[PDB]
Amino acid sequence: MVPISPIETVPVKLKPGMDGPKVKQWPLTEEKIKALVEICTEMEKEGKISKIGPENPYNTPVFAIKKKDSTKWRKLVDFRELNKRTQDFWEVQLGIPHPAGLKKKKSVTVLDVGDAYFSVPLDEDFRKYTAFTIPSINNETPGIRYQYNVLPQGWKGSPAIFQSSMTKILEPFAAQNPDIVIYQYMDDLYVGSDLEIGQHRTKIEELRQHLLRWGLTTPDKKHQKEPPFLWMGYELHPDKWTVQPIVLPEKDSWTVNDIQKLVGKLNWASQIYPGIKVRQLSKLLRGTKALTEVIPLTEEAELELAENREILKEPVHGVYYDPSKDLIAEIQKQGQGQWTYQIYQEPFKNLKTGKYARMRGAHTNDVKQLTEAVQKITTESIVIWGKTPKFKLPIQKETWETWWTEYWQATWIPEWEFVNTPPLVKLWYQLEKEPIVGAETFYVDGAANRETKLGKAGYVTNKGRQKVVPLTNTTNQKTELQAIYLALQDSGLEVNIVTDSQYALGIIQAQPDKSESELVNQIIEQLIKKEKVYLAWVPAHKGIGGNEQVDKLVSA
Amino acid sequence: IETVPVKLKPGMDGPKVKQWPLTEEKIKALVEICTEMEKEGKISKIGPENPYNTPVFAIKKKDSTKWRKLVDFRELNKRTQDFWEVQLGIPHPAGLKKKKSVTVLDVGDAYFSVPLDEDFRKYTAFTIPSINNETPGIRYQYNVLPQGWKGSPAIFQSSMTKILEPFKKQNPDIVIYQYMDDLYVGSDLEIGQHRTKIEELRQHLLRWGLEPPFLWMGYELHPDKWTVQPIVLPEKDSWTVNDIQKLVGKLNWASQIYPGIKVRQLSKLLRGTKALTEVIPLTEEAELELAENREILKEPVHGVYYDPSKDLIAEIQKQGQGQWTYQIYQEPFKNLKTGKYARMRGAHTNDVKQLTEAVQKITTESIVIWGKTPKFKLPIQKETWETWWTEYWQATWIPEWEFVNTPPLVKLWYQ
Ligand SMILES: Cc1cc(/C=C/C#N)cc(C)c1Nc1ccnc(Nc2ccc(C#N)cc2)n1
Ligand SMILES: Nc1ccncc1Br
Ligand SMILES: Nc1ccncc1Br
Ligand SMILES: Nc1ccncc1Br
Ligand SMILES: Nc1ccncc1Br
Ligand SMILES: [Mg+2]
């Protein structure tokens, strides 16, 4: 025999303070038992399990399930209890490659590596925790006791030990053959290259020879798999990629559950289909969790779905990454807090697309949302390609400069150019930095009775203009905003406004262009039609006349 | 040569912190660095039975091509026992902040000479990711004291004093202070005489080494140069309504810090509904009030004291035109330090780079004065900060931070 190097064991522990499983073996029909005995005899013959004596105090139940439409049983050991006690492991497969970061390959060949999973030895000290019992016929003898010598199907540590054992094998091969890529997925090995058919097939054979060093045999009859590959919801081709078919159903009434499937398919499609939108269809789910409640589709949700259907009418594909070329990211505003983007290197062939949705907020503006969308694309691009894209944004360079230099927060977006494609992001108002000479000065105030919810809002000005409005079912915060609204409504194109509302100042200093509050929205609409607004704050109830006067008026 | 026993704190598991996305240039740098470290026995590859993780990245000087590995041990440092076995700690040298020159050296490479306790190593696990996760991340743990970990200067402190033993009595006026990977060396000597003695110190360490990639560097501070920011009121000949409003607002706030401050007589000037730009003459009672306020603001805050048991908090405000103000305190309105920066170098069109440099300068001021880093309240959206701060970071430690999302009205008063 040819010596093979052993695959070294991973030392495995139970969680601190915990012991192995001791779980009832439920009795089996006489039919199931004979099938498990033959099953276990072949596995024992191949080395996967060994008979043990009666000293081992652990146990995990074994079951007999068999494939529909056949007559040769199969064994399921239910490791749920042992898994609760097995230590955590490093999980590597959490981050899955995105197709848009892959490189184009001339050939990708698939190798079968099913033989390896069962030749990966289980740490000797841990094997005792894997004990199981085939019940005896009529329960008149001791059940036959076995334990695993290899990673068992269904045990918590098998995926991460198997993957790390294969990595150690493949590492030196990949390192000494930098003109190929290798990726393992369950019992399949994929090797891609740009080599001429010649050296590519030779590289394949080298790999088989390398695997043989560990005694891992690969089948000679070449694989069933050939490009395109169906993998993790995508279709991988040698020179392009897409998502698997996205078919939006025809339905007359839509369930909670059916809409949740519609949105999921839309989210999955949006990584290659440009312009997908889900705001209205997702907001049919607000708070409710009655899995089968039927929801009427709003007029908006129907226009959004009709929008999406036309986008899904033809298949669309993405191209792969070319590391020799810049990445370009282009962003568009879609409305109602929705943003859409394309990433490409060459005109008219996207690597991928995507969308970004405005967060739940009380007050917001387009520049903040654009900024957050850019940070999201940037981080996704670091993941997929390792570098930041060049940005094409629908905001003028002037607008951005005005925004970031005056905004109270530090803010930044990386290298970008303006793209003149409507609708453009803009500043809807800008407050003055100094008081306006010649503009009427409005001293505003509101107040509300906490028990009656009655209030007043109003102003007095240096020209003697005055107003006080009685208000019902209001609060002090609302009345302070109402007073500012009245001053805006009653002033000319330039106005100085003096308030003591720290609350109102905090909102306006956030520079919103849209709010959840209709009162803030009304103020924003008034600000947009002014030419100049100076907003001044001063402390309440200190003696500031004008403030004191209208405070005496609105708090009566 | 013989490992010191080290534990986590009771009921605490090791760190399991996600590795954040790295640029291709940082991954390449870290793959070369870690290959060399594994070759030199400092780190070893680990298996999947190690579930722990701490994030790693790298920093470099623009003119270096040599990268510095930076492990973010903030979580491990929180979960590691605090060692009061040989000393209850360092009596922080109050004279360090008084030296006309303090040079900051990276001496963390000396730590690699000490083996790490074999049972503790697993908690130093880190991962080098691959672009697009196309290959499994490379997993390592440390065999020796790692830079950036709280335990390293402590365990090496016995050796470090024994290396500075020639510098000890030969220069009895030099204060030397160690913080994480940093050595602070303070002197009142002429800048040329200071530098020679710095290189004097380097040799003692290179001598002991028999090579350190960054010990030749030297960041020079002048804590004697460090400025403060008292509360000052405008001196004007004519006051508009608006000027007086902003004065009374400023004094209102200052009365929360200074007790005797009064605004009665000045508030009385706002009696009336005049145009914001109209000049108002100052009554003599208001004149008196303003003058008395000015003299109050000349004195120190009352009842201000540093307590080493409490956290330091640092707040920063963007003032525009590359100017940044900041305050360090433990209790609100009991500022231990205030200051203002303008010399944000290489960043006139990048706010986030300026804020990052400000954060580093404030942290080193805190280390010099109190021997510990503050917790920052940053005027920035979390996602903006988290995306970029590692591109501008040049220090070997990392403070804690939270994010301010509502504009402070007091920004006006530190202007
Ligand atoms: C992640 C991955 C999944 C599969 C296969 C998963 C499955 N099933 C196959 C390979 C080879 C890889 N690894 C890499 C690495 C770099 N570029 C590429 N490009 C690439 C991959 C497939 C096709 C095709 N057809 C074309 C180019 N693949
Ligand atoms: N361990 C590896 C190294 C490089 N490529 C693929 C694998 Br799997
Ligand atoms: N959060 C919101 C919800 C709806 N319209 C506007 C905003 Br702002
Ligand atoms: N602190 C540093 C910054 C940049 N390079 C090296 C070091 Br050490
Ligand atoms: N190069 C440096 C930068 C910052 N602090 C210390 C050093 Br040394
Ligand atoms: Mg009021």
Swiss-Prot record, chain B:
Changing W389L: No effect on RT p66/p51 heterodimerization. Changing K61E: Strong decrease in RT binding affinity for all dNTP substrates and in catalytic efficiency. 100-fold decreased sensitivity to ddNTP inhibitors. Changing W149F: 10% loss of DNA-directed DNA polymerase activity. 22% loss of RNA-directed DNA polymerase activity. Changing W385L: No effect on RT p66/p51 heterodimerization. Changing L183V: 22% loss of DNA-directed DNA polymerase activity. No loss of RNA-directed DNA polymerase activity. Changing D106A: 5- to 12-fold decrease in affinity for dTTP substrates. Strongly decreased RNA-directed and DNA-directed DNA polymerase activities. No effect on RNase H activity. Loss of pyrophosphorolysis (reverse of the polymerase reaction). Changing E211A: No effect on RNA-dependent DNA polymerase activity. No effect on RNA 5'-end and 3'-end cleavages. Changing I163D: 16% loss of DNA-directed DNA polymerase activity. 24% loss of RNA-directed DNA polymerase activity. Changing V185I: 25% increase of DNA-directed DNA polymerase activity. No loss of RNA-directed DNA polymerase activity. Changing W388A: Almost complete loss of RT p66/p51 heterodimerization. Complete loss of polymerase activity. Changing S152A: 74% loss of polymerase activity. 56% loss of RNase H activity. Changing P213A: No effect on RNA-dependent DNA polymerase activity. Complete loss of RNA 5'-end cleavage. No effect on RNA 3'-end cleavage. Changing D182E: Drastically reduced incorporation of phosphorothioate nucleotide. Loss of pyrophosphorolysis (reverse of the polymerase reaction). No effect on RNase H activity. Residues 214-222 are annotated as: RT 'primer grip'. A motif (Tryptophan repeat motif) lies at residues 385-401. Changing P153G: 34% loss of polymerase activity. No loss of RNase H activity. Mg(2+) 1 binds at D106, D181, D182. Changing K61R: 10-fold decreased sensitivity to ddATP and ddCTP inhibitors. This is p51 RT. It comes from Human immunodeficiency virus type 1 group M subtype B (isolate BH10) (HIV-1).
